[PDB]
Amino acid sequence: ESADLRALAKHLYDSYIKSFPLTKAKARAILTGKKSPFVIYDMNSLMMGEDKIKKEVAIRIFQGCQFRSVEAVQEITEYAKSIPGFVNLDLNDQVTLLKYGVHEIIYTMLASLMNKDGVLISEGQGFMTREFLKSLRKPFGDFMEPKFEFAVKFNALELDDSDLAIFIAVIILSGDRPGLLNVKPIEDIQDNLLQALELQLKLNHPESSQLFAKLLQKMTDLRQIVTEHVQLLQVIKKTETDMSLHPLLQEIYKD
Amino acid sequence: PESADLRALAKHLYDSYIKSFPLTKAKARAILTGSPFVIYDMNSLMMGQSKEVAIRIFQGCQFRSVEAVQEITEYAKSIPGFVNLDLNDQVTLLKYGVHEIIYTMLASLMNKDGVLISEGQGFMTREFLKSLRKPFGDFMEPKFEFAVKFNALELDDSDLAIFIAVIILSGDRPGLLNVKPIEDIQDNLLQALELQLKLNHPESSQLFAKLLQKMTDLRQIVTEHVQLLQVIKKTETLHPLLQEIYK
Ligand SMILES: CC(=O)NC[C@H](Cc1ccc(OCCc2nc(-c3ccccc3)oc2C)cc1)Nc1ccccc1C(=O)c1ccccc1
């Protein structure tokens, strides 16, 4: 079965590259200055970068994150279809799996695009500093800090895209999502994905003790990030009466 | 290339096809021949503003067609040389090839009176499909038209496994980056397909040619299916995640 686990791992990695244009290997190539990004760290550079790469600074930064999230949901959906068993599950659950999964997966892969100092934007054409993202006005104060704090700790695991491909498959196939109708089909798929992640982790990181365990523990951090963000969204929703949330994201958010 | 190698290629493709496609032509034909539950009627579908039946049947086809795409994708990975192709080209070959393959294989579930549904457990008649209000009665009928002509060739699963591989490795899909290796592989599969058909159907003259002529007909069906599929976004309009799964 060992070889069947390796074939699973090879397969998901294949679909991962096919579904997400900006990989972790590409992000790190751009980040670790070998493709150099334009750097947005203030108002004038944000607007200079609207020319050069791509008060209302917060809204532009809002919609730019909405754009990429909608886009991200679409990639994640593409990828889910490739996971063996997914498209054979009950449709209502396939939807439930995505509704809940995409949040968690988005911060996982957002880590790939982050370092200590900032975050890659516009498929790596841009780089926005962590500081500039703290500077925004205060329904949006430090909305990004907890994602940077997670990235810092998650990135020190030193996962690569082939590790990530399996980890996010495991995330999608969570049997504890609320409202799932048939938990057992989902859990059996996850079991095989977990088996494959275990082998992959040991093979790709032989001198990295309990990497499997340590990666699963990061779900605690992931979910707590999810929760605070929904709380920030609502504060906005009450006070940004004229602002707009995309219908795909609307659907993903309504608990 | 040697007949042994083409026989080996032939047999290799049949193996993968049997692993990737649970409901085979042969199985489908066993079921078809004189049970599964028959849907001939509005009350038999019912007994077998939220949503009109025609849309729910449309929806269910999209679900099943998404399952077909994953079976076909997995089968492609087994074609010698496919996974060594450039990755963008594997996506492009699949993107354009899956519809043609879906309608090819749908013929395996069809006779002139209906189609097998739900893993062979059901049978929706042809006439019931036609009953459906515009443009919903007009989506399956062309497929039945093709199926009946197609099934007259009496291909089996072993034949189909190679024909399917030939469709995927089409060098003329828009946006291919490196056509040569795709045509190279397709030539090999055609080589194999031609020997398969002479050996499997020795009394069936120019089957090879006749089969290739049907690749033409499948492109017409795919093209016009789109022109029905756009008369649908048009007059038939939401739950975004769902729409995203079937983009
Ligand atoms: C599932 C899901 O929707 N999850 C919530 C989702 C998670 C997220 C967060 C950051 C991120 O950065 C990508 C890199 C990024 N790209 C830009 C960019 C690009 C072009 C122009 C300007 C800026 O800025 C950043 C930080 C990607 C995804 N967040 C949002 C999703 C929808 C709408 C808004 C948000 C916000 O984060 C937000 C930001 C400011 C004010 C209000 C809200």
UniProtKB/Swiss-Prot annotation, chain A:
GO cellular component, one term: cytosol
GO MF entries: alpha-actinin binding; arachidonate binding; chromatin binding; DNA binding; DNA binding domain binding; DNA-binding transcription activator activity, RNA polymerase II-specific; DNA-binding transcription factor activity; DNA-binding transcription factor activity, RNA polymerase II-specific
Cysteine pairings via disulfide bonds: none
Positions of rosiglitazone binding: 66-69, 103, 229, 253
Post-translational modification: Phosphorylated in basal conditions and dephosphorylated when treated with the ligand. May be dephosphorylated by PPP5C. Ubiquitinated by E3 ubiquitin-protein ligase complex containing FBXO9; leading to proteasomal degradation. Ubiquitinated at Lys-18 by TRIM55 leading to proteasomal degradation. Ubiquitinated by E3 ubiquitin-protein ligase STUB1/CHIP; leading to proteasomal degradation.
Location(s), subcellular: Nucleus; Cytoplasm
Description of how activity is regulated: PDPK1 activates its transcriptional activity independently of its kinase activity.
UniProt keyword terms in alphabetical order: Activator, Biological rhythms, Cytoplasm, Diabetes mellitus, Disease variant, DNA-binding, Glycoprotein, Isopeptide bond, Metal-binding, Nucleus, Obesity, Phosphoprotein, Receptor, Transcription, Transcription regulation, Ubl conjugation, Zinc, Zinc-finger
Cross-link (Glycyl lysine isopeptide (Lys-Gly) (interchain with G-Cter in ubiquitin)): 18
Main subcellular location of this protein, as a coarse class: nucleus
Segments carrying motif 9aaTAD: 247-255
Gene Ontology biological process terms, A to Z: BMP signaling pathway; cell differentiation; cell fate commitment; cell maturation; cellular response to hypoxia; cellular response to insulin stimulus; cellular response to low-density lipoprotein particle stimulus; epithelial cell differentiation
Tissue expression per record: Highest expression in adipose tissue. Lower in skeletal muscle, spleen, heart and liver. Also detectable in placenta, lung and ovary.
Top-level lineage group: Eukaryota
Induction: (Microbial infection) Expression increases when incubated with M.tuberculosis or its lipoprotein LpqH; induction is TLR2-dependent (at protein level).
UniProt record similarity statement: Belongs to the nuclear hormone receptor family. NR1 subfamily.
Disease with which this protein is associated in UniProt: Defects in PPARG can lead to type 2 insulin-resistant diabetes and hyptertension. PPARG mutations may be associated with colon cancer. Obesity: A condition characterized by an increase of body weight beyond the limitation of skeletal and physical requirements, as the result of excessive accumulation of body fat.
Protein role: Nuclear receptor that binds peroxisome proliferators such as hypolipidemic drugs and fatty acids. Once activated by a ligand, the nuclear receptor binds to DNA specific PPAR response elements (PPRE) and modulates the transcription of its target genes, such as acyl-CoA oxidase. It therefore controls the peroxisomal beta-oxidation pathway of fatty acids. Key regulator of adipocyte differentiation and glucose homeostasis. ARF6 acts as a key regulator of the tissue-specific adipocyte P2 (aP2) enhancer. (Microbial infection) Upon treatment with M.tuberculosis or its lipoprotein LpqH, phosphorylation of MAPK p38 and IL-6 production are modulated, probably via this protein.
Free-text note on domains in this protein's UniProt record: The 9aaTAD motif is a transactivation domain present in a large number of yeast and animal transcription factors.
Protein name from the UniProt record: Peroxisome proliferator-activated receptor gamma
Organism: Homo sapiens (Human)
First and last residues shown, out of full length: 235 to 503 of 505
